[PDB]
């Protein structure tokens, strides 16, 4: 609610081409299809193949930034991105060689930030997951066995065994309800009463395990990335030690590309930003082009008024962002700083028009 | 638990008429129906059409409050509220013109506050949603492909292709369990074991993403709307800076219409209010009609007793509300203020009967 | 994890008899049944009827504690508890009069504390629920309509109308998957992709709305009930104002009946209690029978040792409970109090054996 | 995200053998199977039987650590681990004696820590669960009854009774959607509209009840286990009282086995550890083998640089772990301690190479 995401978050075309790349699978998979478009898209495989292969060697030029790097992840698939189709094309002379479009599916995951954010936490919290997973196996066979006791008599063809009953366990436990093989007797139908009660109690924790400290990591991701952009601000030699741990939990940083809009004049002013790198276009008779290490919005927050200036992203600006309360927290947190923001809320009234 | 919502929250009839408006669709949709009621409700379309159209021009008189406004949202549908049916009536000479009752469905959403509250946050947090959505696409085809490996042989008519297998993917992943095409072999039935385990882990985050900071926004909505009604209270020149950030998280404000009841005498006193605008009917021999900038309940909270007065909403009062603990927090937070509430818990004993 | 619930939480037999009471419904509902047990349980209705009716008049003696009370809830059903069966017995001469066993179902809810805890909060937070409920209606027909566009042609008997399509909406949205009427075409099967994605995003908030501040109320329920049992403790004239708001969030109170065990000797000591009313049996050569306003466990917590005494509930004791950390919080929160607990951890070593 | 789990968390083979043990059930359960492998695995039962029985007596030697112990849980199944199969083998002369493989399923749960963590909390919070469970029974029959009103006429074979309708209740309430018996009329199909709305509101709390304070216990589990490893650190005589309650919520402890890696040189330094027991291999010209009561990473955190030393687990080290922010919290929390970490960030530069 308090950030401006711009400049092509889903940027690199190395990721993009999997989506059209893998829909190219389908038409080969289908009888009664004409040969025209059949092979037209086989080229598209060769495009993407060639396209990453074009990209490939430029990556294999890993002399760029060659000091200390850990690029086993990034490179691992690029190699197989082109070999696996290639080795496939010959030995699998039959059309099923296209089935090695299971390969690019990592290419999104290759340059997928936020995916290592996932695997980072599992190796602290899987301690619970396994005791639950065991418990998930406890309750499976603890319950799955209860049915073979019963309907083996009058449902041999369905419940004439244990693992057939294990099938109806997770289906019945995992919220699903396929609807293939269901009891007829009473006591077995009694047993289902606890199952949904159970699995929804089970998953009530287990899926909760994920979001539990995942959110901590992401709420922590908003600090590790943001203890940066702190000392750059020339004012923050006076902030107390504990002051900062409060604030940075809310301060998310995102970038704006050049040319785009930041805050349009007259829109309801609801936030203020801290510029730390780049430059802006504060639309005034003298454009107050504040570069690295600046801010604006106190003209709008202290007064609670619309924007006093159409700020447009002159350049690639690494922005922070902040809603009022936590800035009211700040002006509450210290009178010493509202003084300059009091002055600045007067200086920028005269320094907007003037220089 | 600590607020009095009254005065027609679901007020404007511009919203109301969609509900009866769109049930008017149905009877036309149905064979073997008599023509009597068939066309009776076609009028009702013309009513609502005419009714908004009656409303319409009064809105197009946008000279009301014409200083600085952003009414592209509000007006966008009102225009189409009446044109789309109208242009429909002629070219679609066949009865299917009524199918342009897809149009009013925004009219609730037109004057739906709390809906922009939704879209506000997605443009900070969709960063995650897409990495998950990709991941949702990862796991779809990563898993959907695994089945065509198998049952293409003995289930051509069902699993004789990939996207047919993609169908059984999300159905099997998204908790649903339709029950149309299900395996027969073992290894494919093995694969389902992880699926529900997965999707319930997937959605265990992804739906959690929504409530995650949504609740922050709404818990923030209770501050942005409520840093108002602060300075109006004549007492709050002495409250510390950080005192307020604690409190306003709990203080929700709602309005009471005139005539209605606020706190009935003798009911178990469980809360106290801060009046800031309007007037009341404190039912006493001298009605202590406290107007803008007042409160009551300390007579009941300090003593923990029932109500000492039937307070009824004399007028349209913009109320705050507060349960004890956070008022006990207050009386704990400062002895200087309990003094006047000590006195007031004596003055209002004598000032209830007297003037 | 830190409380001792005892003394028949599910106590009153006025609640109990619904469960056997309503299973008495069934055998009448069933053909090919013998008349013997058919009417045997019709008596059991008359038992419970007579049993509450026996209870009834003793309740209608509402001279007990007759000062200020709000007993419209409690009495409302008791009246109908016996009239509704009675008026049923005659006019409904056919056996279906037993269908007025829909009546006792409130009798649990009659003396169901924790149920008003539910309805208390909905009248603060249903503001959201309705904007969501509208939104739930938005997305219903916004999506339900999309299908009649398509399969009316080749599925008249199933999708030959709108509300038939509304049926497949919520079924498909609400996680369920019945499996009666499913598409065959592509584009309609495309549409389901967003649905589960939606409804699981929808309910991802909406059910979250419930637990959101419900937990606040219950986490608040642990304070409102527990700002009691504070001043009774003779030591708590020195605790700071803000000290208490920290602590009582964790301190839950429950009662122990007489005779039962409290802490058995030698078990791993993990907590300490504050007695405020009743008496104990501290099993020592001189039983240190501490009555109202006492505590024990610091002998075990400071040393981190097993229990030094088999404490058994001599009487009906209203207990508090506390795990270490928040007592370590206390001994951390003030050195002035650890002094007496230092002394007490010596006095009770000598005062356990001695008097 | 901030811990190193190693040394065989899922260690004891007493747990392990259930998994292969119980898959041994299946092949006996199946007709048309050869007798060869039929009996081969019956031995495997005798293996595990004999294997625990081998383990058994060594456990019955409970003279180890015989001071004060509560081993009724641990021993209860071991006894039946071998008797139940044994008594089964004779009286159940038919092959169904193998059905007493319901017995080992506790053996995981025997030495399952984190399972008592489950049952600990239910006896504080089941107060709610039962009022909900009653409410779950309220809404069951409150709703289940509504259908027999209707479809008993034209669905006797399906809805010709109440409990048959109770079947379609929980199936329809508990998110499942089997798909066996579904209405045809309107008003009954109206009723389902609230059901999913209800049960997803129901379970929206009820499963939430579990994770609610479960997470508290586990977030409390990270303190009770970790008020240990506090005084051992020679520095922590100066930490304030309240300082610690902040920190230990994040500090999780895990063990590393001997030989394994701790922090490899050059990897991106993201955390620092507190050694309290064991020894390391700080790979330097003079290996700075810090034993009980040590730490490292401030060389990497203050500078925000990669690792300055390949630390490998020389021995079984009981490690703590800590990411920056909470160490930045520390260096923020007190200048007095950053002094020695300032010096140490210089001493270990010279004391890494030197001794
Ligand atoms: K389902
Ligand atoms: K189904």
Residue numbers in the entry:
A (entry chain B), B (entry chain A), C (entry chain D), D (entry chain C): 1 to 355
From the article:
We then applied maximum-likelihood 3D classification in FREALIGN28 to determine conformational variations within the 2D crystals, while imposing C4 symmetry and keeping the alignment parameters for the particles constant. To obtain more insight, the consensus atomic model was flexibly fit into each map of the 3D classes using Normal Mode Analysis and then refined in real space. A rotation of the selectivity filter by about the same magnitude also occurs in this trajectory. Finally, the most extended conformers of our ensemble (models #1 and #3) also have the S6 helix crossing bundle and the selectivity filter slightly more constricted (<1 Å) than the most compact ensemble members (models #4, #5, and #6).
Each of the four MloK1 monomers forming the pore has a transmembrane domain (TMD), a voltage sensor domain (VSD), and a soluble cyclic-nucleotide binding domain (CNBD), which lies in the intracellular side. Furthermore, we identified different conformations of MloK1 tetramers within the disordered 2D crystals by means of single-particle classification.
